A paper describes a structure:
Here, we determined structures of the DNA packaging intermediate and mature capsids of T7 using cryo-electron microscopy (cryo-EM) and symmetry-mismatch reconstruction.
Another two independent local reconstructions focused on the portal and tail, respectively, yield the structures of the portal and tail at the same resolution of 3.8 Å, suggesting that the portal interacts firmly with the tail. The T7 portal, which exhibits a canonical 12-fold phage portal structure, is formed by 12 copies of the 536-residue portal protein gp8 arranged around a central tunnel. Each gp8 can be divided into five domains of clip (294–334), stem (335–356 and 269–293), wing (1–268, 357–427), crown (428–492), and C-terminal helical barrel. The tunnel is 140 Å in height and of variable tunnel diameter. An extra rim of the top opening, which is formed by 12 C-terminal α-helices (α14) and loops, interacts with the core. The dsDNA is embraced by the 12 tunnel loops in the portal, which have a weaker density probably due to its asymmetric interaction with the dsDNA groove. Accordingly, the tunnel loop channel becomes narrower (from 28 to 22 Å in diameter), and the stem channel becomes wider (from 25 to 40 Å in diameter).
Numbering used by the authors:
A (entry chain F): 343 to 427, 434 to 488
B (entry chain E): 6 to 427, 434 to 536
C (entry chain D): 440 to 536
D (entry chain D): 245 to 342
E (entry chain F): 50 to 98
F (entry chain F): 148 to 293
Write the structure that this text describes.
Amino acid sequence: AVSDAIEARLSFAFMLNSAVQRTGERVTAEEIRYVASELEDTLGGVYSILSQELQLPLVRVLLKQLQATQQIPELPKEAVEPTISGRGQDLDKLERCVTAWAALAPMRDDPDINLAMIKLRIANAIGIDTSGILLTEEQK
Amino acid sequence: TGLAEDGAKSVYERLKNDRAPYETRAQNCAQYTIPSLFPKDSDNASTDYQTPWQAVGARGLNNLASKLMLALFPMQTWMRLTISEYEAKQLLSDPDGLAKVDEGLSMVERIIMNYIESNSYRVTLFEALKQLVVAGNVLLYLPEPEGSNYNPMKLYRLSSYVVQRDAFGNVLQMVTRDQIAFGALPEDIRKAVEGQGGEKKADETIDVYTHIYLDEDSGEYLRYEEVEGMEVQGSDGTYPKEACPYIPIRMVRLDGESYGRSYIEEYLGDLRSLENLQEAIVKMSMISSKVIGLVNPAGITQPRRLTKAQTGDFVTGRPEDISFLQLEKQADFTVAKAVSDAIEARLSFAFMLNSAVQRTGERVTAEEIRYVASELEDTLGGVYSILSQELQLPLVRVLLKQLQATQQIPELPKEAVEPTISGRGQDLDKLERCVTAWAALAPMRDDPDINLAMIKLRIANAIGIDTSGILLTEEQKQQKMAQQSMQMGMDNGAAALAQGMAAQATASPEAMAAAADSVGLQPGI
Amino acid sequence: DKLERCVTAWAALAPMRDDPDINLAMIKLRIANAIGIDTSGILLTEEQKQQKMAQQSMQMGMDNGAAALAQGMAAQATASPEAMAAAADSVGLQPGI
Amino acid sequence: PKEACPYIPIRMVRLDGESYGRSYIEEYLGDLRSLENLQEAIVKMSMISSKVIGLVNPAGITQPRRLTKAQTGDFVTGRPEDISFLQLEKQADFTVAK
Amino acid sequence: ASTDYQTPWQAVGARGLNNLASKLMLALFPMQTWMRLTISEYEAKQLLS
Amino acid sequence: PEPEGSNYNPMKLYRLSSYVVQRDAFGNVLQMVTRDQIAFGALPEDIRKAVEGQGGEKKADETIDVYTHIYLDEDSGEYLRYEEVEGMEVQGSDGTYPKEACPYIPIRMVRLDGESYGRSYIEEYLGDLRSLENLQEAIVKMSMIS
């Protein structure tokens, strides 16, 4: 029972799930295992040092070595990189503002609501940038 | 000159005798949770860090530093720039220019998030939040960019800095201690060390101090670096009171002491008792682990035959002579276990981990009932609430200044300020809610009685969305009524002459051959 | 909530837009009286409709009107083909098409 | 003015006509005072439990001069009923205070 | 060769290493586009139409 | 390594028994030394001219301790990198690696200042595994008397 208690408190320190080495006795079901996200958050503390130490210098070397062998276009001295765990933010913020604009679909005949402005407000609330976002003055 | 306070190497030494209360707390306080996080710093390689007998402090720290990082600093736009709305109405012609200003404020709040993520500020803040749990009291320095290259920020975890503040909240003076080696020194400092005299090894370290004292007769800070010499002559920086690159962070604030406490010293006594149980349960299993064969010496069984026998030999003796020395404490192992399962139960709510394995458990507690996990979010909401003032606002007010000087940001016109909203948020949900209320008015587009022009204003008044880009104004519709007509004018018009020209372009077939020559077609068809 | 509740009660009156007996002009006032929403921006007043009846007509006036002369001009702008070359010169087009 | 002053004193539960206010958790501070006195005793009962004393029956055979110096699996002289361990009692008392 | 490596009596460290090295590899380095290049957006507006 | 073409180009690692770095109490690296043991037939072409240039014939399979040295430069912020043999250099040596882009990057599990190397993650539970093996050693041995 001590060895089953030490394995229990190493199995959270490592990113394996709670498993065989008890009675177990799950009945713990079914939406309750969203506490497996607690293992992802504990995993999120592990590699967080390592993304600076490995994950950024591996790109900054390859951004230089591919310029010298001409396998990459010479990017003009002003682009830098995050290791986003990957867009991501460009996709979800575009996917969310579509569904908000899709709710404005039964308002295409309403004479009062400024639908030209509400589509800009949602584009302002959600942090999508602008100016490729709407038809400009001439443009129609 | 004398510079009105002297000397900066002795300001560090007078006030090093004030860290020693907090420092010897944190050396005790990291000993119980995770000893690699805050060393005693009379520590080298090797001094191996023995793991504590309990592993709740190691669990409940990473599970609390990450849940602060996930809550303070989400991946999206955790700051936003509020312009003062009434002073924005005065200086501007309504209403299109107002949201055009908020696009410039949505411009800046994305560039900072593209500056924070692209300089690994997420890393050194998570190293800051682990120090803020164990010890509190970290200042992290945000250096000047000097280009669009890679620019991290260095932190100092209370064994490398000294601050002195008032009983009042403001900081008087800060001293930071570097140990930069001689080959790795900056260029202006090497001229000062050689200017002091004597050659140096390439790897010899140098105690490089700074001194960030509050100025005599002016509210700004003065900042000078030093070596064993007096200054370095690249020193003097006029840091204002509200924007200084050295900001000392503080877990739970206590007045009027100079530093702050830590969060996990508020349970460090309880971990101290929970290790003393978990030290005893493990040691009771080690007496258990030893296998002693107690032979009854008033018996027959000599183990001269018990050892040398084979797999299945028939041996002389009685089974009741050979008994084994077993660990007792059946009714005592359960006393020390049920208390240790009760202390871990009341530390697992103090830390933001969920109720878990360390019981029978025995959930049947299902399925909508676990909305009481929001009680952990609310207890988490009390933890960082001090820290949003201490870290989360000065980190923006520095970056709003440093990006103006390097021209990576537009000079925002002296009137925009920022909350750290946990992120709109309020601009999205209040817009999303008034759409669904206006969507219920859709079967009333033909009702002759209800003033739908007013109800859409009332919901825009009840929900606090602002107004005046919200509705079509007085003129605003004769333009709109023309655009449906100019559409049908251009549509029916372009369909008229195209049926009009091409019908009479090809009739009495000599005209058909003449019409093909205008395009340039010869007689093919 | 008091605005959101009176919408759903008025939404139940939607299949009664053709009933010749029920005073729907009054029931919408009674629900606005029962639920404590205030009044007087709540309903179209006396005048208030001859303006509104004109806007459906001025829409169909501008719509049928702009569709009339655009079919009206462009049909007679290009007939007896010398007029077609004269019509293209008014825009500024030479003889390309 | 009387209605707009930048110094406003806040007050948990109001009591007249004393100058200050009380607090909410002093209305249960007596009960916490009794609940710590239990939880102080349950933990201290686990600490007598934590100590592992080997009571050797001195009218027996087992001398622990052989029990300590023995290896992993040695055969040693003695009876198992001489070696008992001083364990914390209070089985039916730990449940009262719990 | 030879020095044969005796397996430890416990097999949690052998379990909890491969189950942690792979879950770092699956989280640090997914199969899709784990880096991206941010251009400085305001300096991109200045140098471009 | 450098590509030198679009052919197959892996990357070699060194698991702390084949390299040495030295860094400051500050975070930056001062000097790195990597130790290879490339055999004589498997050496690169410029190095074989240096080993033969040292003198004496070699076996086809004899190993050679080939060192590099990636020290931070005097009076310039870039790194200097030279390979060596038992001789002084190899005359294909000097590389002006900048501070931000060097092909040798030392990785580090949990960072601790100001020691030269980093710790590991599973040494933070290595004491606890040491106690858990001592139980699991005893349970198995109790089943063998059984």
